[PDB]
UniProtKB/Swiss-Prot annotation, chain A:
PANTHER family: 50S/60S RIBOSOMAL PROTEIN L14/L23, LARGE RIBOSOMAL SUBUNIT PROTEIN UL14. The modification Phosphoserine is found at S6. Component of the large ribosomal subunit. The ribosome is a large ribonucleoprotein complex responsible for the synthesis of proteins in the cell. It comes from the Eukaryota. This is Large ribosomal subunit protein uL14. It comes from Mus musculus (Mouse). Pfam families: Ribosomal_L14. The keyword Phosphoprotein applies. It is found in: Cytoplasm. Its main location: cytoplasm.
Swiss-Prot record, chain B:
The modification Tele-methylhistidine is found at H244. The keyword Hydrolase does not apply. Component of the large ribosomal subunit. Interacts with DHX33. The gene is Rpl3. This is Large ribosomal subunit protein uL3. Residues 17-30 have a biased composition (Basic residues). Disulfide bonds: none annotated. Constitutively monomethylated at His-244 by METTL18. Methylation at His-244 regulates translation elongation by slowing ribosome traversal on tyrosine codons: slower elongation provides enough time for proper folding of synthesized proteins and prevents cellular aggregation of tyrosine-rich proteins. It is not required for incorporation of RPL3 into ribosomes. It comes from Mus musculus (Mouse).
UniProtKB/Swiss-Prot annotation, chain C:
The chain holds residues 1 to 62 of 157 of the full protein. This is Large ribosomal subunit protein eL24. It is found in: Cytoplasm. The modification ADP-ribosyl glutamic acid is found at E4. Component of the large ribosomal subunit. The gene is Rpl24.
RNA sequence: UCGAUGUCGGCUCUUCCUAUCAUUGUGAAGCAGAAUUUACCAAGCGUUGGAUUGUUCACCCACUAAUAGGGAACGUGAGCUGGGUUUAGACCGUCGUGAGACAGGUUAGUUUUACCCUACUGAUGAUGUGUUGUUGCCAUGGUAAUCCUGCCCAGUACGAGAGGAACCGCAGGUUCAGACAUUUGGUGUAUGUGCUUGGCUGAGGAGCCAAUGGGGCGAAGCUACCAUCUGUGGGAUUAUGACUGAACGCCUCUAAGUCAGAAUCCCGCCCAGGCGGAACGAUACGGCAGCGCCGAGGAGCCUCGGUUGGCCCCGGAUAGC
RNA sequence: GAUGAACGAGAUUCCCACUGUCCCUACCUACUAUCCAGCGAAACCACAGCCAAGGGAACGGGCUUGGCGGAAUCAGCGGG
RNA sequence: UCUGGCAUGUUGGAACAAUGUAGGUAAGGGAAGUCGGCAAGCCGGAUCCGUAACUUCGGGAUAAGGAUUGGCUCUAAGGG
RNA sequence: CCGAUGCCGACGCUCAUCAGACCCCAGAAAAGGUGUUGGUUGAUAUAGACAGCAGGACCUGCCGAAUCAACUAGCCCUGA
RNA sequence: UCUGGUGGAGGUCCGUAGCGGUCCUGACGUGCAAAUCGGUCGUCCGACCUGGGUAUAGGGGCGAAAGACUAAUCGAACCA
């Protein structure tokens, strides 16, 4: 089971797209698993499923809602064994509902939290940080 | 009309009076239920909060992602020098409740315990218990004591011990001992009284009350924070920037028709210094305290069976806003109430411990001892001297000596 | 229980201290504190900062 | 109610109702499983983030266990806001000869006062026990936890197939609550230590001024689901399903008499602690005194009043004693 | 009537940049508020001031019936 | 900062609570707040490059976008 | 409470896990109950009633005296 | 015709003093003030700002026009 992680990406955040589908942006519009509370924005961290829209990218996937998974984040979070880790940028990849990647390759590192939750994403990762 | 969108209320009315606690020492409001089949034992103890540090251990819960993996856990150190038994209290059960039947005190009571009986010890003549003690010596008084133990034997259902902490051994400005009643559980009332009588005037170490990897309750008073607004006291939503006459307040404090402010509305007032009882705190370690053996002082507190560093639980430079810890201590997982130096009440659990988390046996691999007075990076002074090398102050001392 | 070395100061990092920094190009760095972390993010050269291990090794101070 | 009860909506916050969306426990189906529908106890708990609109309403996007409906002077303006409506400026259309009208559109347009009483939040205190202190008990009031994933059960039961559960158990998370800084982050006038602009002390050294000159890194402290820790047991029972069993020679959960039974209820755990008690300790300078016990021994005085023999005791049953 | 460069403390929509507007609040500074010495007002005031229901000029502090009620005060507060 | 002028603007002492007035800072997001980017923030000087649509040919224009900028030691040119 | 039944008052009815409790007056209807109590009408039963024990398939034998149906109206209950 | 200079026009632009008064619907709102204060703003060679002296007086004046102003008084001032 996945332990709780410091969330850094609320609704409205634009993150890089690390796959090779042609999308360059992911604009987060919602997060799975979020019941929510009054006035509280849904927020996502590494390993979380989100609905995003492509703001810059190839036209055939620009004006739609896509599933995506966050693989890197700038907000430092505490792994057990007391390690605070953050990345240089926020990133995600476009996937389907079952978790399979729409792309075939991932640029840059992938957090260990998202790799363990999503084996298909991990198999496309060059490195795990 | 109805609230447009539902939201749970801010705060809990289970801590409603939200005032300064009438007591500085934590109070046991319910002792563990007595079981006569169990051996005679104590149920509570008094310690002092020295500070916090973090440990490293490997966990043993099979289905977890951290199973057989090394984790870092925050802990709190509670210095617990032995307590001295000075009295016995008997209670009888009545249809109006538990009533104090008779209390008996020991012959010699130390000056630190007598200090609790005075508001100005400096001006006092120290006459407390000077006539009571003579009863332990006189033959007529001795008979009355025996009769008073016998009446307790045949009439009392609850037996407690009056015990106090030794503040000589603590690095605190205060010299006045904390007195407490600790209930005796197990056995019969006769066996409780015999147990109490024989260790009257004696010393009870903390290892005879609590054991390793057991889950205990901590009672104490919360850190004081004075007068506070509803935004900090009750965590209400801040009003917009362009609000007239104040942002940090509750906009509507009630409807028209009940025509009164209800007790359930957040108001500004005292925050902190509240009596609280947290219930599931595991004992990660029971330290041994400094002792002199063969002319050499043993500092080996907080040396695990994986580092053997020959260091003490004391961090480099000492605990901040608290002296050195030289006595027995209890290491608890997590945080506890109170400031530093705050006296804590530790009592046995009222619940039956059966979950895996409560029953698991923990074994520390490392204990952090870096300075808490900054961003400490050296565990011991010897480690720092080896890494740094000779300094100018050492060469100056060598020049002065030679 | 592995102990790391700081990527800027060369100091010994104990388990519950500091932060780890993973770059987009795949390199992972360890920082003892935010003083070392800020100097690294400022592109400062540790060989030019007096209190680093690298500076003392270069200047043969030990 | 017109010698004035501030007015739409939103924001904030509490409590209440149930005509129940979900969750607990059930009954029924055109209930095979999954999903769904109908009904009962039931309001403990929860009922979201956004685009457009001044809007209530509506509609769509997206998560969700669900995104139920309402009240409290169509809750809530000395709590806010002022977008709209509702003054005076101005514009258009239509109407009017005109001044001007519009239940039509548009743009700009002062939101006052609490130090009084109560209510509520905290803070001293009060009467009593001769004084004072320590340790404690409890009346009574408050009260709190909540929901969901994944693994396994199991591709199993069920089903022709397609599909496709559940109890025990394990690992976690949401919402809420109570704390807490070991660690990460924030703050930072320790005005701590470097750097730097303008000026000033003849220059160096050392400093100062620029309402905190600016900037880097910063101890302690405070603080963030932005770090960490903790959150619990019983009783009588509801709906329901039953047992024995008449009424009513059979039958019947009901009539007498029994059983199991829950997010409800009551208590516990937790918070407070009565014009409410308890056990214990010590109880007045030393030469002037006060105080305690011996029902102390009396003699007398003032004051408040009531009353005008006692019963020192089985437990109880009541179609029996 | 239509249009239109330049201009506008005029009304409006979107985009980049930027941000405590917000998620979600926190810490710091000065002046207050605070307490003290000295000085020292005003508005307002039938009497006053704890509630529930009732009836009543149909929304009571007073009346009926219940709940109950303990000197003197301090800092806040905006239900009445 | 000097000449000249003053005593902090009708009082002082102590403390550093809530709320406020005024001034700041803030991790990760970056208008998701709100009627509305209101408020705040970003930009900002000079030098060297480079500047669109449109246009009443005047402008738009500091359009937009980019680089440099300290201290010290020199060199060349510019006069009576 | 609150003056006055502290009558050895009379006959019945009614149990409600929202009982009921007095003119105006301050809350309930249609429709229902094999709760209980009265009442009306019809019918069965010595050749043998109604039950129950079974068979043939409405009849029989075994127990051997009341039973069955419809309706009506009081209190109580559902409707609420 | 093009280029480089010179020149110094403009109810020209940035922006001091001055004149004015956008937004915060900020402060204050029994005020410092019967209209003030701060930040931010408009203009700043002109249809510019300003002193003194003069003229117009109430159904009258004056009005780059708001029923504005005409001594805190204006959809006809003040005094008796």
């Amino acid at each position: 089971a996945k332990f709780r992680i410091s969330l850094g990406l609320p609704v409205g955040a634009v993150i890089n797209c690390a796959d090779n589908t042609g999308a360059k942006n992911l604009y987060i519009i919602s997060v799975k698993g979020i019941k929510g509370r009054l006035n509280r924005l849904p927020a996502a961290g590494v390993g979380d499923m989100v609905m995003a829209t492509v703001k810059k990218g190839k036209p055939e996937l620009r004006k739609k809602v896509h599933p995506a998974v966050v693989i890197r984040q700038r907000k430092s979070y505490r792994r057990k064994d007391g390690v605070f880790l953050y990345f240089e940028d926020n990133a995600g990849v476009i996937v389907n509902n079952k978790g399979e990647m729409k792309g075939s390759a991932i640029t840059g590192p992938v957090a260990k939290e998202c790799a363990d939750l999503w084996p298909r994403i991990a198999s496309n990762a060059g490195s795990i940080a | 009309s109805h609230r447009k969108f539902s939201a749970p209320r801010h705060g809990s009315l289970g801590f409603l009076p939200r005032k300064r606690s009438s007591r500085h020492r934590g109070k046991v409001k319910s002792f563990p239920k007595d079981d006569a089949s169990k051996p005679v034992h104590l149920t509570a103890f008094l310690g002092y909060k020295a500070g916090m540090t973090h440990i490293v251990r490997e966990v043993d819960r099979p289905g977890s992602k951290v199973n057989k993996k090394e984790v870092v856990e925050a802990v709190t150190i509670v210095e617990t020098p032995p307590m001295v038994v000075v009295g016995i209290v008997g209670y009888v059960e009545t249809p109006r409740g538990l009533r104090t039947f008779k209390t008996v005190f020991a012959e010699h009571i130390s000056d630190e315990c007598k200090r609790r009986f005075y508001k100005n010890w400096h001006k006092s003549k120290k006459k407390a218990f000077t006539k009571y003690c003579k009863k332990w010596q006189d033959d007529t008084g001795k008979k009355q004591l025996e009769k008073d133990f016998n009446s307790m034997k045949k009439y009392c259902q609850v037996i407690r011990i009056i015990a106090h902490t030794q503040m000589r051994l603590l690095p605190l400005r205060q010299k006045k001992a904390h007195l407490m009643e600790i209930q005796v559980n197990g056995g019969t009332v006769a066996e409780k009284l015999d147990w109490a009588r024989e260790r009257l005037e004696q010393q009870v170490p903390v290892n005879q009350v609590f054991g390793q990897d057991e889950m205990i309750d901590v009672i104490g008073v919360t850190k004081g924070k004075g007068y506070k607004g509803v935004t900090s006291r009750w965590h209400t939503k801040k009003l917009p920037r362009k609000t007239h006459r104040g942002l940090r307040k509750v906009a509507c404090i009630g409807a028209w028709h009940p025509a009164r402010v209800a007790f359930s509305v957040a108001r500004a007032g005292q925050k902190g210094y509240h009596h609280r009882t947290e219930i599931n705190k595991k004992i990660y370690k029971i330290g041994q305290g400094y002792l002199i053996k063969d002319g050499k002082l043993i500092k080996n507190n907080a040396s695990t069976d994986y580092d053997l560093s020959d260091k003490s639980i004391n961090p480099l430079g000492g605990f901040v806003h608290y002296g050195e810890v030289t006595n027995d201590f209890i290491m608890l997982k997590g945080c506890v109430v109170g400031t530093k130096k705050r006296v804590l009440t530790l009592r046995k659990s009222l619940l039956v411990q059966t979950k895996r988390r409560a029953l698991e046996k923990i074994d520390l691999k490392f204990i952090d001892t870096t300075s808490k007075f900054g961003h400490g990076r050296f565990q011991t002074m010897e480690e720092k001297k080896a890494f740094m090398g000779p300094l100018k102050k050492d060469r100056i001392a060598k020049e002065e000596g030679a | 229980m592995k102990v790391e070395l700081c990527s800027f100061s060369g100091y010994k990092i104990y388990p519950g201290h500091g932060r780890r920094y993973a770059r987009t190009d795949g390199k992972v760095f360890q920082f003892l504190n935010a003083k070392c972390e800020s100097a690294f993010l400022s592109k400062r050269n540790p060989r030019q900062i007096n209190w680093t291990v690298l500076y003392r090794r270069k200047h043969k101070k030990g």
